[PDB]
Write a protein that binds this ligand. Structure first.
Ligand code: UAC
Ligand code: CL
Ligand code: CL
Ligand code: CL
Ligand code: CL
Ligand code: CL
Ligand code: CL
Ligand code: CL
Length: 87
């Protein structure tokens, strides 16, 4: 497990979909990010590997207008900018 403390804006995003903690496992961060994308319908209905976020907090956090879920390394990099790893 990787324990992480989200920075304030990522924390706000996580709490908007029901998160309760100040530190998380990475698995939990990915869970809540997926739930956020689903509930706000940011994914492309006609190609559900694509996420559009140019008009959303997520686009500010990741620094991109859109991304493909297949870009695993890049998405991890975007998430890790928004947290600090703790032990
Ligand atoms: C509506 C619907 O039904 N949609 C659309 C949708 C798209 C995007 C987000 C939500 C919905 C399906 C097609 C879907 O995609 N749904 C329902 C998510 C829940 C999912 O099932 N996802 C995507 C996902 C989960 N959390 C995310 C957070 C972000 Cl920021 C972006 C995408 C996701 C699978 C394919 C996935 O990638 N999962 C389960 C992670 C945990 C994982 O397995 N890995 C990690 C990959 C990555 C997240 C680092 C890119 C590997 C390395 C291992 O670990
Ligand atoms: Cl983890
Ligand atoms: Cl922040
Ligand atoms: Cl929000
Ligand atoms: Cl939680
Ligand atoms: Cl998940
Ligand atoms: Cl990759
Ligand atoms: Cl770190």
């Amino acid at each position: 497990e990787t324990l992480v403390r989200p920075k304030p804006l990522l924390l706000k995003l996580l709490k908007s979909v029901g998160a309760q903690k100040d530190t998380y496992t990475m698995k939990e961060v990915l869970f809540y990010l997926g739930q956020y994308i689903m509930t706000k319908r940011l994914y492309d209905e006609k190609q559900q590997h694509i996420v559009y976020c140019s008009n959303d907090l997520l686009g500010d956090l990741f620094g991109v207008p859109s991304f493909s879920v297949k870009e695993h390394r890049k998405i991890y990099t975007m998430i890790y900018r928004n947290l600090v790893v703790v032990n």
